[PDB]
Amino acid sequence: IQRTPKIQVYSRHPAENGKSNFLNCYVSGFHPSDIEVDLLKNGERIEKVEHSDLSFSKDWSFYLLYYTEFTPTEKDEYACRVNHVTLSQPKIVKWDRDM
Amino acid sequence: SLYLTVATL
Amino acid sequence: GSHSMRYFFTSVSRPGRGEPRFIAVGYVDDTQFVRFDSDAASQRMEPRAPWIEQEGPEYWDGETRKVKAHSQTHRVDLGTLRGYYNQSEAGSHTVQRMYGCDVGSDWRFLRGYHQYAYDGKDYIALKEDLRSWTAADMAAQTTKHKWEAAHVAEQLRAYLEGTCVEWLRRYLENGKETLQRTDAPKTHMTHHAVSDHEATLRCWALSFYPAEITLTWQRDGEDQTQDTELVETRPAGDGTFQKWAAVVVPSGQEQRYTCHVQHEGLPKPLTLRWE
Cβ-based burial of C141 (10 A; exposed 0-12, middle 13-18, buried ≥19): middle
Q: Domain residues for A91?
A: 1-99
Q: Is the peptide bond before C20 cis (omega within 30 degrees of 0)?
A: no
Residues C128 and C193 reside in one and the same domain: no
Assigned domain for C275 exists: no
DSSP state of C230: E
Q: How many domains does chain C have?
A: 2
Cβ-based burial of C252 (10 A; exposed 0-12, middle 13-18, buried ≥19): exposed
Residues C160 and C245 reside in one and the same domain: no
What distances in angstroms separate CA C45 from CA B4, C53, C113, one per listed residue? 14, 11, 22
Cα C162 from Cα C129, distance rounded (Å) = 15
Residue A85: CB atoms within 10 A of its CB come to 11
Q: How many domains does chain A have?
A: 1
Q: Among C7, C150, C152, select the one facing B2 at the smallest CB separation.
A: C7
Residues C134 and C217 reside in one and the same domain: no
Q: Among B1, B6, B9, select the one facing C70 at the smallest CB separation.
A: B6
**Number of C-alpha atoms within 13 angstroms, CB side, residue C247?**
24
To what resolution in angstroms was this structure determined? 2.2
Cα C100 from Cα C159, distance rounded (Å) = 9
Cα C64 from Cα C9, distance rounded (Å) = 14
Cα A97 from Cα C228, distance rounded (Å) = 19
Cα C242 from Cα C71, distance rounded (Å) = 33
> Which H/E stretch holds residue C178?
helix C176-179
- Beta-strand pair A21-30/A6-11: antiparallel
How far C118 CA lies from chain B's nearest CA (Å)? 11
Q: In what order do the strands lie in the sheet with C3-12?
A: C46-47, C31-37, C21-28, C3-12, C94-103, C109-118, C121-126, C133-135
Percent helix, strand, coil in chain B (nearest 5)? 0, 0, 100
Residue in chain C closest to A54 (alpha carbons) equals C23
Cβ-based burial of C215 (10 A; exposed 0-12, middle 13-18, buried ≥19): buried
Assigned domain for C168 exists: yes
DSSP H helices in C52-124: 57-84
Q: Count of B–C CB contacts within 8 Å?
A: 40
Cα–Cα–Cα angle for A53, A55, A60, rounded to 5 degrees: 160
> Which H/E stretch holds residue A63?
strand A62-70
Q: Among A3, A22, A52, select the one facing C120 at the smallest CB separation.
A: A3
Residue in chain B closest to C82 (alpha carbons) equals B9
CB A7 within 8 A of CB C234: no
Tell which of C181, C215, C232 closes a domain: C181
Beta strands in C51-185 (DSSP E): 94-103, 109-118, 121-126, 133-135
Would you call C12 helix, strand, or coil by DSSP?
strand
